[PDB]
Design a protein around this ligand. Structure first.
Ligand SMILES: [Mg+2]
Ligand SMILES: [Mg+2]
Ligand SMILES: [Mg+2]
Ligand SMILES: [Mg+2]
Ligand SMILES: [Mg+2]
Ligand SMILES: [Mg+2]
Ligand SMILES: [Mg+2]
Ligand SMILES: [Mg+2]
Ligand SMILES: [Mg+2]
Ligand SMILES: [Mg+2]
Ligand SMILES: [Mg+2]
Ligand SMILES: [Mg+2]
Ligand SMILES: [Mg+2]
Ligand SMILES: [Zn+2]
Lengths: 283, 143, 132, 242, 130, 78
RNA sequence: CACGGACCAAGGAGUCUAACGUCUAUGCGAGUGUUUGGGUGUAAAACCCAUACGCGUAGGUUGGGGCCUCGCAAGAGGUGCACAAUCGACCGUGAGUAAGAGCAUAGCUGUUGGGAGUUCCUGCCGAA
RNA sequence: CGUGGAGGUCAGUGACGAAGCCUAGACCGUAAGGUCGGGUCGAACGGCCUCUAGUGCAGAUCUUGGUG
């Protein structure tokens, strides 16, 4: 929930210019909807899916791209990056050579993820190996560009890296295997254009009759809400949290005098009086 | 505290089991002849002198009569016969449990022999061993 | 009926966790009632329109109460004048949200209502007509 | 260099916990005093009941002796309590007795319960005569059952009656604060007999230690079988089972 | 967002998770103090966190705070525990002052075990030197 | 005849007679996940590991002090 | 034990698809569905526009979960969701109105159907 | 529990021996089975999250070859 992100130059030095976050990143992150839509769409390569649900899943994936913990969870080596969501200067769109783009990626700190994808290449295990699906390798960083100026050609050859236009983002590209939080690199122009493409609090989304989804729960963290300050005033005193065992074993009163007295105090006096063996008058 | 506790130490719950002095069987009384069913002197008749705090009965042969010295014996491994001798002659205070961890035996034996002499044939009884002959059924046998 | 929502929605589960904790740790039955409502299926969560909210507030002494709808609220163009209130519900249609904001009212999630009213003080629960 | 400061939430938590602990200690002291007073009350009630029972028995015996002396017969009041025990398995049971058995809270063989004696209830026993054995319970049998096999229904969870406080928390509304108070409500037909009896879980009884007596059970008591109305002899049976 | 992150990681693919035969789960995360996937355990799940981890002969302490959740490159602050075991525990308690007992206890236990491992690998690799 | 009543106690379930739950291990990194749980768990080297890797795993396991269920397997027979 | 037994190797008793409906989850919401076409496209895809039509819209009192006051509590009340109860008005004697919920997708699944023997292991609920 | 299909993932495993098959061996699970050891095998394949297909027998008409 930062206000803004700092652009980073291709060489690596942090850029003074800063860009406010778009409203997409503050959107619901729903694994279930993304999973269902991902299954339905992956069956096609057919299942009909509601357009609004599809956009919802896309927004959820985009929001997941900012949560570095989820990106680590999927497997990307985002341990060493300047920050998240990772933004790079717009000049990136105008690179013409693969080697220059790779060097810029090394400066960006995505070297580890690319090395992982390179090492992960292995021969296809199944018989699909001879049906045009022979080599399998892990997924690399995604580079988003507002407009192509030759960056697309440079980064085509390098393994693991896929580029997508801002106006055309894909759930399959954003959330491989129905898993949220793919590592993404946004060009500076792309980061700005995301607002126009998806919309902000006071800006139309540019999609006809579309608004970003609302949150059922205003706060993600339930621990903050449950603790709060006023609830604990409203809450009754707590228990032990590990119940004390009462009556693990049954002690028969007839055989154990202590519990017999506990159940009945008058038994003590009656024992002394021996009323049970009392003598009725002979009369 | 030189090592931090690896894993954790589960403290045992407090136990409500207090040890209390033993309640001996009714037959066992000081000056009661006994039969030992195990050990070095199994099947040998001995005299009973006193009950120790650690629940080990104290017994004398006497070593003079039968060669069995002063010794501790467990109560459950012993049969008690109905014949008695008066133990008042022997004082039997000094020797105790910790003491066990010749002259004393002589002092005890003189007093115990003094009472043994009165009853007929008792010395012969204590001298000889006991065993089960064929056709002997313990459950009827009055000891 | 149910012991937990059949839905696999993360946020609904979070709200259910908060409200079951409050119901366990609060004497007020309001938390229990809303907890049981959260489990209900779509058919058992009929929409409560802004129209019904207007009627519920017209009842005497309920003008300043916080209306609660465990579910969704839908707009109703039939009305021109709508009073100001701080409705709380799971979801709000764009029309209903605009009507509430326009009339000086405001819409809150159920967690924000729990922060406001842990014991459900001055609350008014409403349920839509489940004719079919 | 500078000292760290306590978190501003932990301090609030410490304040709240201290106040709660003080409140709990005060409640504990008050509860201890109330427990002492409760034990005194229980002792008084037990003494009163013991004297009442002894006087009632002596009065019945003296009434019999006096009636005989006068030459006039004495007739005892019809017993207002019975104890029923299940004898037969669930299989091979018609619907009409099966539904009745559910009402009497008997769901398994060898289980048993107390039943108030009325014209309505007697016919129910008549319906289930083949499958149950019942009779008038004496005070001693009821006492032994309540002390040994007594179980209380607390939120439908068959809680054992190991302390007077457990019975109090449930039945103080009806003026019953101890196991013996419940035993009195059972041995008599009190104004709250229904509630006290329903509080007791149905008794779970072992098969009789000595045996069932007759070699064959499944005939009626006079015919020479276990099931049926055996009246006072139920006391002999139940004690063997309990 | 920690609760959302944890719930996704729990009911979806925690890539570092390994499902043992018993059914217990182990996060492979090197920074993880307790190698068991739980609410308190995944460094991914929790914003506030700490660990003892060995680098060369040293047994460093790594700190994680919600403040540096962004910029994951500089997220983990590195602190040198003194070779003296008592001083090391004192430093751990000081740094973990006013810090939830779970991480503190687990951190101390991990430091003890790593110290023992360093001692015993010195044992296995004793050489004629010195 | 198998049935649920034969089920073993939870506290004793999935326990070898040595008292250690078996955990599969492929490489050194997976071994290191069992660093402190030496009392609760014992490592078991997978069937598909090569002989060169097994000696490294055994050395690291000895250094960590984690019991290996199947040492001297493919380095000795039976 | 009572009853039967040339021999070895094999092979070994029919197919895709439709209509209506209950329940559950998700998206939107007096709306809802796009794809009937086009643009765009590291190119069946993915992203986006219209273009239409489909199915929707066009009060009295009592009880009442809940919330407010008083009360330590039982209660005293006050107020009243859904819905019911009867009491009626109006529209046109009910499906009534006097403050609507549906559409779409997916899962499971009942019935009708178009040619149309046993059943991996464990557990659970259970007529007659 | 087991069998395949696809997506993702374990910077997984492999001539210091991968997959397949056997194993009256050890461990685990109530069980379907799983893990390891050994044998066999001799070049690549497996674990894990998701969606998608999909668990072993009986018997008859007989047919064919082959043997009387
Ligand atoms: Mg606790
Ligand atoms: Mg128990
Ligand atoms: Mg519907
Ligand atoms: Mg009114
Ligand atoms: Mg507290
Ligand atoms: Mg017998
Ligand atoms: Mg007995
Ligand atoms: Mg093998
Ligand atoms: Mg009305
Ligand atoms: Mg009314
Ligand atoms: Mg695969
Ligand atoms: Mg096999
Ligand atoms: Mg076994
Ligand atoms: Zn994890």
């Amino acid at each position: 929930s930062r206000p803004q992100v700092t652009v980073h130059s291709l060489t690596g030095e942090a850029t003074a210019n800063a860009l406010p976050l778009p409203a997409v990143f503050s959107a619901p992150i729903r694994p279930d909807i993304v999973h269902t839509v991902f299954t339905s769409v992956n069956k096609n390569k057919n299942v009909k899916v509601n357009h609004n649900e599809k956009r919802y899943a896309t927004a959820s994936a985009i929001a997941a791209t900012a949560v570095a913990s989820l990106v680590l969870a999927r497997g990307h080596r985002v341990e060493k990056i300047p920050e998240i969501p990772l933004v790079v200067s717009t000049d990136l769109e105008s690179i013409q050579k693969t080697k220059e783009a790779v060097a810029a990626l090394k400066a960006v700190g995505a070297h580890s993820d690319l090395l992982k994808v390179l090492k992960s290449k292995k021969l296809r295990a199944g018989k699909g190996k001879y049906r045009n699906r022979r080599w399998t390798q892990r997924r690399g960083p995604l580079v988003v560009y507002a407009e192509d100026n030759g960056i697309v050609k440079a980064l085509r050859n390098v393994p693991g890296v896929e580029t997508a236009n801002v106006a055309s983002l894909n759930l399959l590209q954003l959330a491989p295997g129905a898993h949220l939080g793919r590592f993404v690199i946004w060009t500076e122009a792309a980061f700005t254009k995301l607002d126009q493409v998806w919309g902000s609090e006071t800006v139309a989304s540019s999609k006809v009759g579309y608004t970003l989804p609302s949150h059922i729960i205003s706060t993600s963290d339930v621990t903050r809400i449950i603790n709060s300050s006023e609830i604990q005033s409203a809450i009754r005193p707590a228990g032990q949290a590990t119940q004390k065992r009462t009556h693990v074993l049954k002690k028969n009163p007839l055989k154990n005098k202590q519990v017999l007295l506990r159940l009945n105090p008058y038994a003590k006096v009656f024992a002394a009086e021996k009323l049970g063996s009392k003598k009725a008058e002979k009369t | 505290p030189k090592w931090y506790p690896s894993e954790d130490v589960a403290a045992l719950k407090k136990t409500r089991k207090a040890a209390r002095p033993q309640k001996l069987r009714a037959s066992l009384v000081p000056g009661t002849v006994l039969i030992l069913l195990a050990g070095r002197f199994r099947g040998k008749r001995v005299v009973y002198l006193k009950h120790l705090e650690d629940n080990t009965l104290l017994i004398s042969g006497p070593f003079k009569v039968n060669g069995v010295p002063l010794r501790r014996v467990n109560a459950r491994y012993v049969i008690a016969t109905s014949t008695k001798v008066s133990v008042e002659g022997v004082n039997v205070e000094k020797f105790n449990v910790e003491y066990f961890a010749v002259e004393d035996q002589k002092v005890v034996d003189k007093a115990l022999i003094a009472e043994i002499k009165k009853t007929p044939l008792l010395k012969q009884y204590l001298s000889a061993s006991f065993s089960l002959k064929n056709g002997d059924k313990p459950h009827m046998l009055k000891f | 009926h149910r012991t937990a929502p059949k839905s696999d929605n993360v946020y609904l589960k979070l709200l259910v966790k908060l409200y079951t904790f409050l119901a366990r740790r609060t004497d007020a039955p309001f938390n229990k009632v809303v907890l049981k409502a959260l489990f209900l299926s779509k058919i058992n969560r009929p929409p409560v329109s802004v129209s019904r909210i207007a009627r519920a507030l017209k009842q005497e002494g309920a003008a300043n109460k916080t209306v609660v709808v465990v579910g969704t609220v839908t707009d109703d163009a039939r009305i021109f004048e709508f009073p100001k209130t701080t409705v709380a519900a799971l979801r709000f249609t764009a029309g209903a949200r605009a009507k509430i904001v326009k009339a000086g009212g405001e819409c809150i999630t159920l967690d924000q209502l729990a922060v406001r009213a842990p014991k459900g003080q001055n609350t008014l629960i409403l349920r839509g007509p489940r004719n079919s | 260099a500078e000292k760290i400061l306590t978190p501003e939430s932990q301090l609030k938590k410490s304040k709240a916990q201290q106040k709660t602990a003080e409140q709990v200690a005060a409640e504990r002291a008050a509860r201890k005093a109330a427990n002492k007073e409760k034990r005194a009350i229980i002792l008084e009630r037990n003494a009163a009941y013991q004297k009442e029972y002894e006087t009632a028995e002596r009065n019945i015996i003296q009434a019999k002796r006096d009636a005989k002396a006068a030459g006039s017969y004495y007739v005892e009041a019809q017993h207002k309590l019975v104890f029923v025990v299940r004898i037969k398995g669930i299989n091979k049971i018609p619907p009409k007795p099966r539904k009745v058995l559910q009402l009497l809270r008997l769901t398994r063989i060898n289980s048993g319960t107390f039943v108030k004696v009325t014209k309505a209830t007697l016919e129910l026993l008549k319906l289930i005569e083949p499958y149950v054995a019942y009779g008038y319970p004496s005070y001693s049998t009821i006492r032994q059952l309540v002390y040994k096999r007594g179980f209380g229904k607390i939120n439908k969870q068959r809680v054992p009656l190991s302390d007077n406080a457990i019975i109090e928390a449930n039945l103080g509304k009806y003026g019953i604060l101890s196991i013996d108070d419940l035993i009195h409500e059972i041995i008599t037909v009190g104004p709250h007999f229904k509630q006290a009896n329903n509080f007791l879980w149905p008794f779970k009884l072992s098969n009789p230690s000595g045996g069932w007596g007759v070699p064959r059970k499944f005939k009626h008591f006079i015919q020479g079988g276990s099931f049926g109305n055996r009246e006072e002899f139920i006391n002999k049976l139940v004690k063997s089972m309990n | 967002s920690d609760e959302i992150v944890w719930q996704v990681i729990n009911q979806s693919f925690c890539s570092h998770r390994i499902k043992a035969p018993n059914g217990q789960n182990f996060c492979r995360n090197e920074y993880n103090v307790t190698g068991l996937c739980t609410r308190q355990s995944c460094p991914l799940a929790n914003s506030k966190y700490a660990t003892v981890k060995c680098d060369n002969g040293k047994l460093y302490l790594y700190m994680k705070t919600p403040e540096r959740a962004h910029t994951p490159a500089k997220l983990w602050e590195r602190i040198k525990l003194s070779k003296n075991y008592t001083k090391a525990l004192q430093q751990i308690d000081e740094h973990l002052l006013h810090w939830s007992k779970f991480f503190r206890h687990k951190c101390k236990q991990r430091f003890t075990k790593l110290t023992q491992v360093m001692i015993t690998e010195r044992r296995l690799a004793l050489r004629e030197e010195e | 005849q198998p049935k649920i009543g034969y089920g073993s106690n939870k506290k004793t379930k999935f326990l070898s007679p040595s008292g250690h739950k078996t955990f599969l291990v492929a490489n050194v990194k997976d071994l290191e996940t069992l660093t402190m749980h030496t009392k609760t768990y014992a490592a078991e080297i997978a069937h598909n590991i090569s002989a060169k890797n097994r000696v490294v795993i055994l050395a690291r396991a000895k250094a960590l002090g984690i019991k290996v269920t199947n040492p001297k397997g493919r380095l000795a027979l039976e």
